[model samples]
Target: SQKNYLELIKKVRERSNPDLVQMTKMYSETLSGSKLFSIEYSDVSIYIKESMKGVAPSYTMNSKVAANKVEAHLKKSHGNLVDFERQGSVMTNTHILKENDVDLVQITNKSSEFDHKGLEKALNNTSVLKTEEILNLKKHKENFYQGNQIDDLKYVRLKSELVLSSTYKTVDIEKENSIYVKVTEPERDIDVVTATYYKSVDFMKTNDKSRKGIQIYNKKTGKINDVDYPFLSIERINVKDIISNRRLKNMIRFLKNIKYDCPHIENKGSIRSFHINAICYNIDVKKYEDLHYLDLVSILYQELTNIISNKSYRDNIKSVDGCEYIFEFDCAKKLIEIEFLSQELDSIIADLHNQS
Candidate 1:
């Protein structure tokens, strides 16, 4: 049994991606390897099992403490003026590397920003329910202007900076989208994003989705950034995981592990976790259903190969949030990075099947 496993690993060593092959060797030698097919195991299963593992408990505990401390400090200073929540890869359980930072968004909830004209148009569009729609829209507009005129994202960000800088010794307030706080007792990095509610483009803007959107503050420009649907993205990723029989996130974790473990292939591109989540999310559930991890990787590799080579696939790929094309801006670099990953999977699969 061990001999068959060794022979299988020997084949893996000859795969195309050098760093990935090296990672396989290390995983096979360590406790990371999982038993597959009655001792007919390979590094493929190791990747899957390791990817499925949760992030470090120490990091989780420390991150919570850091976030709580930041929240408490904010509340002590502002008191019911701001809301706090965690978001991003860490919150979504898609974190693969130790470099993942906790996202703590501080929201100024007393008032909000929205499309007033769009809201008016939406109210006017309804036929029978026009009266009710206008009433609701009026309430929404009133909610937007409930707070002080100067109480905005810029004000919140500045106030947050003052609070955090005074409370924590390792606070960095100059970051564009977030105030970075590094906690050293147990060690964790927390990104405190200052934001305000950005409701809907209109009642019919489907992507706006129940008004669950926020515009983050950009400190450099003294302006609020564009609306970000992070909560909706999280919801969609969770739902897709359920639809794909829990394999969607597994594939994301696997790909993320490969991205971080093998630097040569992944380091060349500026691919973010958002892009990876979107790419995996775009794949059909049928492609991931009821297959072994090895088989799943094979199918995923083939599909990604097709996507990289085909223009139509490139043009139609949507972000995980269903907002826009994930690769529209950095098309060339995105394709090249995915191409390298696909080629690596092909090589690994070839090794497993060839059996020479």
Candidate 2:
């Protein structure tokens, strides 16, 4: 059934969650002011280096160089993490304009004896690894909020033990699976995690696939938390090439920024960047005259409606999932509820104007 998009829009016109679409619409437009990126990468690189006052190039460069050195040494070291790979890196996550204090990277293996097929097989949705497969499976790993990747728990203990024991001056074992290393030189944190070694590429790639997963090591509760390494391919690049990553990502970032303020979306963890990306990916290119941030929001709202009618909503938004896991089936209703309650939307909008 075709949705009464007009009717939906009219109904949604009054409903809101302190919608800052207008505020951001103004803010994002100002950013587009007349800079053309048609300039070559090298030229723009130099231009940005010399001109952008807020971009913190030297600090990020120092941290990045330090990060590479750390990555090189770990790989070339005693070989806990052998050869490597990168799914996301360099000038990484730069769209946010938030200065980074750490440079995380991807690393591969020739080291930890976890194998090809066995490790792959073991890494599936291990949520149900039988009774005494649990004998060694792990306890809750205590108050550490970071989670563990599931399936089998072999090499789990071994890997975590080695990772939690990093020789860096103040490497803190933050969770069952991840560690935080503080380096005070040019000064930046190094977040090292191993890829949940598997071999699969859901889309185009010139290199092999051994997707990265967040590392977890908790010797305390004897638990090994692993991140569910969802997919290994660049799903975004595929979608962005057709439309525009700028429009897509900017809209996503806006939602996330709002989520920080609105718990209905954040707490449900319903609408994520990938989730929004996938929802927007299905839009017919012919539907719009131009893609704007608010237009993206409307598109997302429509897609949210479409999913409301389907049952298969509980799926990963991107091929590659991150340290945190999410699915709409379990979380989508909150958005609808937020819509229904008219929870301070008009008021919040007013509040924003007052603050400004």
Candidate 3:
């Protein structure tokens, strides 16, 4: 059963790409996202389609059903094995062994059947039966008789032509521009909210200056290419402005100074906050940026809300009523500061200082 389940998981993972795991994690974490989902057992199969308005979209799977469907398809494509029955229960037959089941038992049985015919013909034609050869045949027949009582388990081996088909649909919330997004859970945790916002942006313009555009600044060469821009300047600018603000600079400095025992951010030069460089160029640049910001805001909201509701961050500073931190991307410094806080605010800080 363990082996069977493991194989089933492997097959499902091969088919769903990243959706099944992501959805599973989301269901586990979020309250509203928790919903029972289904997967076919044969192979991971997923179908995706745009949802029509007034219709709610969902995903489902049933491993037993999937297994049966796969079995039916296989039987239809390939011939079913012939079975021997004894009183309605299937009985084992040693003859006509499958390719995988070929053994000494089958070889011996076939030879015995051939010899029986040869002996019958030889007896009918006495001229053909030599005395010495007939005596040798009797010895071989005695050996066959001794082997006949040995219990040889019969195997019915059938070749299977199994195929899987799965369909997935995304709910059409046209009013909200809701589209199905597939993301890895690891990536999703970092940038869930920001991803949804960025996807909301209208990407209709050829060179969308109206929508934020990024420019790659080659600090070494002082060259800028709009097409080859290393980072999205617009988004980075938003993130930097937020982290560099007077209120958040001290927090940013502390994060930069932390001497973590890791190769990722060991050197001061290597440490680039989301405000400036939270994203790696080689990774999914756009998707990473989207999720990076999403995670940032989620962490920020949790921190800010805790400060307002629990008065946690107020121990070191004076209390103020209704202190709301608004993160807008239009202002470069403020936006960048927001970006910095979003990426750098660790859970430990959230726990210790109640600031994220």
Candidate 4:
């Protein structure tokens, strides 16, 4: 028995070649990267037959006519290396037997011979085995190609879903009586994830209390067809330590007086003078109205710059208080109407001036 086992191992060692090892490694690497086995199931046996059928259709098909047709086609096109059998509704083939049933001892002997003489010629001349090495190679190649293609498609679907639901929001708000502003180019390398929701609300047009609204995009196509909401609120304030301080008390009095008389001035939260910077004002308009958006933004930028340049505010504002004011205008139009966000707006403006 020991001698027999040793002979079998020697045979397998001879049959195995560098190409077989490389192919096996490739398959393992691909499957590992895909986390194919990470899926949890209540009963994996339920899928065993289906999985086998994918590699050997006859294994699952019971019809004699279909089995014969498939076998005939394989024999004609593939030179009779491909074989199949039908038992009731279960069909199997030499491939299944070689892959699942062959003992290690036999495989070792076979591989040793294959390595010495090459599998192609050996399988062709061998009377013991019915299938050729070429058939095995073709089957393996087909399965490998199909598996990778499906993985690539699945990745694309996941990417599209992420794009639909991602959200971008402003940060760096101060808690004092003054307003804080910050601006930077939109980050291109960021991964954005978005969640979608739908509801109804009655506003400018409908008399009913409910109207259709979508929160975020979540789809394979990466296409979202919904309305956007873009609006912002701003506040200004003076900062002083200790509520009882004489200067702080006086400042509060003055603010109260201003709020009482000014209808447009709402008493929003306050912040420190060091936090005061550019402020974004509301500009409600459609995205298609490019001229309107441009004009509104231009006016707001000029206004903010004017405020920052003022001697009183300028001297009181910290050097780091510099910031650009941003207004979203029409949120719904952002998806389809606004393309400038994708481009370098400042560079585009400079180029236009150079051309002029």
Candidate 5:
């Protein structure tokens, strides 16, 4: 926290190394480059963020109207729980990343069963459901994710889709994966997603979670994803308290700006922002405390070499959500993504080197 590097240099020569005065000034300027990096990063990220202008206001209005309709259906059909069922927030663009237009989410409550058979509670509710076959059909349809499969799990969504279809213009009730609804006015598809507020994830403190992400539903796949609290989990472990948030975010976005211009990575989805974030998060910020922003440009790529070489980055490491950090995903097969990311990483390393 030396206040004025120039003035401090002349006063009896501090750090007791007057012999290294010019070197100190040069190092201080490197420090200033990081300060500059922080600024330009924000400027670039702000531009990248505002790029969502085309979709933001329309998405906002469309979502509000859609949420109201969905709520009205839930309120009438099954006595909606205001807290459990609520409209998701409008997503503003992240500094350097395009945030999803993910608008509505409906979470399953802790009720032992969430079956929606009919409007009336069976007076003799003790009678077991006669529709095991129906669940089997849905299970096949959803590719029912293991541990999440339970009867009545999909009831709310089915009802919501039906209601939404009726309420809005059903531009397309069926896509290959998602149900797409559109408004009559400043129109676009307002995708409504239904998922459970997975209890296991809420508790899983994680080992190597991604930085920023959301758990999305695959309408075609019927599975729930635990992408991240959007890489904050990674930042919490790898960046926060380890380095200044400003520096970490700026460098992360700087890498993103580099990646944005690359058609190879973008077309292939070879390396994600999370991939770069994870690598940088793992880097020891202390090592770069006095390094120039340009210096980090090289160091970031070099360290990525170390992380990929160290192990096979698996699905859990890619997007960890739970504390146990344990899952039965195929390690060998998942290595393909790791390898792909590594290939892109090394390629970008050279590209980054040239630019740096």
Candidate 6:
């Protein structure tokens, strides 16, 4: 490559028809840009490699202690009126920081809302509808009125705050969707999300699967925030991780590390940790399966680069929950960040190859 230096300069000059000194200056500037990028990429791979080492040992135990304490308090107060389940990065093993909090959801066991729209769309078809009713009457009560009463989302949210505030010292119930419980000993925050079971018509008769639907209660407002399927996303991530020999999660952490470590990543706020998780979840498992660590990284980089390059892939991308599209509304800026991150990954791979 060094033998053609003079010829390379001559060709570059002829191609652009620029000033000799000005052309050489631009050429040298381009060279320095690549040099700096290669250096940065070298350091970036360290963070990427370290991300796969997993979070701290106290990560789970600390969060679990907090979770158990909160659950005990809620159970003591509400008895069987509510059920508890955990979600978010902590539960999925995708959390990059040790200080990540548990997304503990307190579900109302007595009543639930069904997906009326989903039922109408499916026309209540046999395949869409269940043969048997949700038999767990105690766990999931029908949407009928018991008497001249209202068992609503605000009722549950208020009841949860009343129970928690009496016990915990620092209970921040001012938040919109969740209650933040500050605990000592382990020194952690538990985001206690109060929600009611929302049975989607598609999974209505599927027993446990129907339980995956939930509508979080808004503390400030008297209504539920939005229809979300947190458990379904968790299950999808778990399945993908299993199929890819656990490379899916490793890649997720690696991507998150890039989001933190990569400098000059524009519009960083446009993409989220869950967004990164969902994007990686969509990649073909066969792309990263049964490969060496470095090879797996390369496969992820290539796949992501491909995805960002294709408009159709970005347009049709779905979250792990399979409920909604991601790149909609104000999320158009997300593609810019993703594409930049993908370029950085490509540079990292090239740098590693140059070193080897």
User: Tens digits of per-residue lDDT for model 6 on 1-356?
Assistant: 11222342233233222232221121122232332223323443333445553465466668978888888878887756678888788777777676776788888867677766655555434453333543332123343345211254566677778988887788998999888988775778999888887776546545556246778877666577678888887778888888987678878877776676555564248888868888889888876566655565577777777666777877788878777677764555786787777876776676566655
Write model 5 residue lDDT over 195-308, tens digit each, in one string. Answer: 544322112222122321334445566655653253344335433423542345445544554455433344335455445455445456776656654445456556544544
Candidate 4 — what's its lDDT?
0.24
In candidate 2, stretches whose alpha carbon ends up further than 4 angstroms from where it belongs are 1-63, 79-81, 85-108, 111-168, 201-227, 230-245, 263-289, 305-329, 332-356
Give the number of colliding residue pairs in candidate 3.
26
Q: lDDT of each structure?
A: 0.67, 0.39, 0.24, 0.24, 0.41, 0.66
Best model number under lDDT:
1
User: Per-residue lDDT of 1-356 in model 3, one digit per residue for the tens?
Assistant: 11232343333333333233333221112222111122211121111100000011111112222223333443454223221111100011111101111000001121112235554454455465567655544554455434321121111111110111121122111211111112222111110000000100121111232232222222233332232111233233334434333112222222332212112343333233332222211112232222322132233444434433443332322111111122212234433333343333343223322211
Ranking by lDDT: 1, 6, 5, 2, 3, 4
How well is each residue in 1-356 modelled by candidate 4, as lDDT tens digits?
01122332233323222122321121222232211122212122112111111212222222333334323332343222212222210111212111111100000010000122233343345455435434553332333212332233233334323322232233221212111111122211112212222222122112121222222222344343343211100111111112212122222221222222223333332321112212221112231122221122233334334443454532332222122222222223321211222122222223323323
For model 3, give the 10-residue run with minimal summed lDDT: 191-200
The clash tally of candidate 5 reads 10
How many steric clashes between backbone atoms does each model show?
0, 16, 26, 28, 10, 0
TM-scores, all candidates, are 0.78, 0.50, 0.16, 0.14, 0.48, 0.78
Summarize candidate 1's per-residue lDDT along 186-255 as a digit string, tens digits. Answer: 5777888888877775432443343367888788877777898888778788888888866787778777
RMSD to true structure for each model, in Å:
6.8, 13.8, 32.1, 36.6, 15.4, 12.5
How many residue pairs in model 4 have overlapping backbones? 28
Q: Give candidate 4 regions above 4 Å deviation.
A: 1-195, 200-213, 217-302, 306-356
lDDT of 6 at 223: 70
